[PDB]
């Protein structure tokens, strides 16, 4: 049971770490989307592209 | 009683392509709409499968069992009746006998004194073994059985369990997909390294009816099996055959 | 306790998990058919002599030892090397039933390490003997007023028997220096003597029918099992199930799946057992897992109030001021049709606030 | 298994760490949706006579015929996207996010950029 | 062999985790570089600094 617990706990920690990295990426994308919503939809932007 | 057959015609055994045959259900587990990867004893796709004919040709050699055996039978009139498994095929060791005579299917595990050329011969003449001294297991089961019938069998001997997988198809080998359903789980617990099939003669000397059988050997490999909504295997992928299937 | 503080701020806090405990235990296995032939061994009309003791091998059937234990005429049940209680659980590869007839005084010689005429010359047991002996009186069956001379024992032999050895020879015993030459004269005796049973002998000389069960386990896949008791089948509740040695806990419901005849249990997308076929009645049952929920507590500040609401995440309200949300079942809040700004987020458009605790 | 849980207790606060991290991610997703879509505190509505100088916004304005109150483009977008583990629902439903997009579209069509910097 | 496999597997998972974190940092820097290429090279920017 100690072997099964350590293996499953390591798997769960790996999953949570992957979720944190993906959450950081999605947070960055959401921050970009909020910036686009403010600057492209709520105003006219002179920023190229 | 044993009879030597001296009227054979010398010819080398043929070889042909396995195509996508020899697939069986790996376990007793239902699966629906999923793809499952198994590392089991399987027959490779498009492999070199040995071809024997019965036509004056009477092909009954004794072949090594290896790790598993795929037997294909393009049969009409039920000439092929059974198989013999063992190590030395005598009273020194213990052997397994599978027969289907005119009435019932008999499975025996005994120390048979086998004939060099065992065969079957209304059917009223049985010349398979001369003696059976120590019988440890008996099992009586249901009848298993232009060319009209394709009979596919897979024999495995893993962990002392002898697995027989079977499929019947109304019909060289045809090109198509047919999954072999598990038929018999046999508790023998004996060593098997060599096998020989049993034929039936027709007497009017003797004449051989038109039949063909194929012998293939199993190797450890992974297959990707496709299960439909009804749990029937419809397609398979051999992961080690070609790069496209490896990608699949 | 979860936040390690005596003051809790306003918000929703996930605190524990909700599990539906098992209500009953269900044990299932196949129908008890294809019984072994212990009736042909024990309830036979005629037994063999002890020198030519009958050996019956028992394979590929179900062996019910509970019949032998529960019969009161079978007086002697001396079992060595294995307990009689755990015979129904322990599985063996082959069962050897050695059957013979002896007298009353020689019942004790059917044991490991014993000696006498029966142990040396008729039936020898090994010291490492795994199996039980069964003996019962048969004065009504095996005795006649004239006397029954159909039972023989070997009185003389040149050497003792090996364990589980049968000696059926009728060679004239060599007790003297001169050769016997097959004639039972001086110092030459016929080695087999007759037990002359009569119905008027004492308990030490009445005929006793003895059946010795020897259990062996080999490298073959053991097939002589005990009868496997099946508990009656309970559906629609979260119960423990034991289907053919597959253990688990789940709600059993009727299934629409069309299993193939070989197929017994079914696996889902994630390879967990989601369907099973009952071994006795060939029907398919889905095994939904017992309800699991995240127990979250919605509370305002402890400075303001001590009222709390409980959210069971992903749990229907019928299986736990009760309101059903997509997030789960909310207990302790009253839904208000009025819409306000979100104060405590619940989910799926539902938010909670304190004004009592309301959900909107 | 109760014995497994008893053995698991010896390892400390790993379970609490994992739950806390997942809870942080879960609240972060709702915060992300709130930041992107809830940028207006007034729900603007388009006039009933949807004539804007020859400009057609039918493909982006909400469809009254549809129960979800989504635009044809939004409906197309939703159509084209398809054990101890639980999935928590998002705080903002698809209908409310669609309502926020509708409010932003109504503000940007009827008021230009004025609504983003103050009154519409 | 198990002790060696779990140690090496832990090392490899650690390496992949730092690679993913560095990938996120480099992706952020690349996104900034693409923004600079669009707004400084392909147009004139009124953003200070
Ligand atoms: C059929 O032919 C086989 C092959 O020669 C015979 O098998 C041999 O028989 C001799 C008889 O003296 C034995 O010494 C050999 O050991 C046998 N060979 C093997 C491999 O077992 C067989 O006896 C023939 N059948 C009959 C009925 O004579
Ligand atoms: C605005 O655009 C929509 C869609 O492009 C126009 O609706 C179409 O109208 C014609 C004739 O009236 C129909 O044949 C099409 O099937 C309509 N398409 C859809 C998707 O509804 C609409 O006419 C345009 N003008 C106005 C004033 O709304
Ligand atoms: C099958 O094996 C035979 C000899 O065993 C060989 O001659 C033949 O070429 C093989 N088949 C193929 C397709 O290579
Ligand atoms: C088939 O074999 C079984 C087993 O030996 C036997 O009992 C039966 O009589 C056989 N059938 C015929 C027709 O001889
Ligand atoms: C096998 O048979 C031979 C002769 O029939 C006998 O001597 C031997 O004891 C037997 N062995 C077993 C294990 O039954
Ligand atoms: C089976 O027999 C073969 C040869 O007869 C031998 O090489 C092999 O080791 C045996 N296997 C077992 C499991 O006894
Ligand atoms: C699956 O079974 C249903 C009825 O049980 C049948 O209508 C359907 O055609 C089957 N599907 C396949 C692929 O055979
Ligand atoms: C099992 O036995 C019961 C009788 O108790 C019977 O109703 C049922 O049909 C049997 N099932 C099978 C598969 O034989
Ligand atoms: C023998 O007969 C008795 C008498 O009813 C019965 O109880 C028992 O089950 C039978 N079989 C055996 C093996 O004792």
Author numbering:
A (entry chain C), E (entry chain A): 993 to 1041
B (entry chain C): 14 to 68, 77 to 142, 153 to 176, 185 to 210, 215 to 247, 257 to 300
C (entry chain B): 301 to 620, 641 to 675, 691 to 695
D (entry chain C): 746 to 827, 856 to 893
Paper lines:
Cryo-EM structural analysis of the human ACE2–Omicron spike protein complex shows strong density for ACE2 bound to the RBD of one of the protomers in the “up” position. We focus on the structure of the ACE2–spike protein interface in the most strongly bound ACE2 molecule. Although the Omicron spike protein exhibits a measurable increase in apparent affinity for ACE2 relative to the wild-type spike protein [in agreement with a recent preprint (19)], the apparent ACE2 affinity is similar for both the Delta and Omicron variants. The cryo-EM structure of the spike protein–ACE2 complex provides a structural rationale for how this is achieved: Interactions involving the new mutations in the Omicron variant at residues 493, 496, 498, and 501 appear to restore ACE2 binding efficiency that would be lost as a result of other mutations such as K417N.
SARS-CoV-2 relies on a trimeric spike protein for host cell entry via recognition of the angiotensin-converting enzyme 2 (ACE2) receptor. The spike protein comprises two domains: the S1 domain, which contains the receptor binding domain (RBD), and the S2 domain, which is responsible for membrane fusion. The RBD mediates attachment to human cells through the ACE2 receptor and is the primary target of neutralizing antibodies. The Omicron variant has 37 mutations in the spike protein relative to the initial Wuhan-Hu-1 strain, with 15 of them present in the RBD.
